[PDB]
Design a protein around this ligand. Structure first.
Ligand SMILES: COC(=O)Nc1ccc2c(c1)N[C@@H](C(F)(F)F)CCCC[C@H](NC(=O)/C=C/c1cc(Cl)ccc1-n1cnnn1)c1ncc-2[nH]1
Length: 238
């Protein structure tokens, strides 16, 4: 996160850190708890990932230093990638992780609500991007979960900012015209959380941008409201 500040413990209880175990253990991507055995994240996180066996999901983490060999985690039973996904810049950048065990909900780990189909017509004015990613292009993963408040940008304005790309309504953009606040390397897969009528909604999944926090380069997120039926198809399968 560029231009953010330290989160407080329990502030983003749906935020997870997804770690890879091969060749050595390290943070891979962010993610969001959406159900007691479900993590919603970005499809591009699994590039080269040949098996769910190398994945570890940690919930209830403020600091990456809380993670050692004796720290409990959730194993991943299955990686579900949207089957229209090709690359982050073309959209469909969404994936689900089916956990091997159930998350016990508490004040440290709980799910974020998905947006409603009717809420597609609502204007969100209180949106935050969170993660352990870089503070600038050449940096390192941060120990403490960071947060940054960012305004949503219309599809028309985002398309103006990305000449040469096709910004679809399945993407949602966020950033200041002058830049300064954004997601950066290591934040992808994490949430873009918006508070509406005292309820937090998972509005976006951190996907891509041209550089980090640059002037007139909004962050591009998977527009979660456009995938509610796809998520329900995969998580509510009979
Ligand atoms: C010690 O642990 C470690 O250093 N972990 C570590 C470190 C860095 C990484 C990473 C793991 N993840 C990638 C990989 F390949 F390293 F595993 C996979 C994932 C590959 C893509 C990922 N993209 C983002 O996270 C966000 C991009 C992004 C999103 C928005 Cl909304 C705006 C601007 C953006 N940026 C433009 N340029 N940079 N950001 C990333 N790139 C490097 C990493 N992640």
């Amino acid at each position: 996160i560029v231009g953010g500040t330290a989160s407080v413990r329990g502030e983003w209880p749906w935020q997870v850190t997804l770690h890879t175990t091969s060749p050595t253990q390290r943070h891979l991507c962010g993610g969001s708890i959406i159900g007691n055995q479900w993590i919603l994240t970005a499809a591009h996180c699994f590039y080269g990932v040949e098996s769910p066996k190398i994945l570890r999901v940690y919930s209830g983490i403020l600091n990456q230093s809380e993670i050692k060999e004796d720290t409990s985690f959730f194993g991943v039973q299955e990686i579900i990638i949207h089957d229209q996904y090709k690359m982050a810049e073309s959209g469909y950048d969404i994936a689900l992780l089916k956990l091997e065990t159930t998350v016990g909900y508490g004040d440290s780990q709980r799910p974020i609500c998905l947006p409603s189909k009717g809420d597609r017509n609502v204007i969100y004015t209180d949106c935050w991007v969170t993660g352990w990613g870089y503070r600038k292009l050449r940096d390192k993963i941060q120990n403490t979960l960071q947060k940054a408040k960012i305004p949503l940008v219309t599809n028309e304005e985002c398309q103006k900012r990305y000449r040469g790309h096709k910004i679809t309504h399945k993407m949602i953009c966020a950033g200041y015209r002058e830049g300064g606040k954004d997601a950066c390397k290591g934040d992808s897969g994490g949430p873009l959380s918006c508070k509406h009528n005292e309820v937090w909604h998972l509005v976006g999944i951190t996907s891509w941008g041209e550089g980090c926090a640059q002037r007139e380069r909004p962050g591009v997120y998977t527009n979660v409201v456009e995938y509610v039926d796809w998520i329900l198809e995969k998580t509510q399968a009979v």
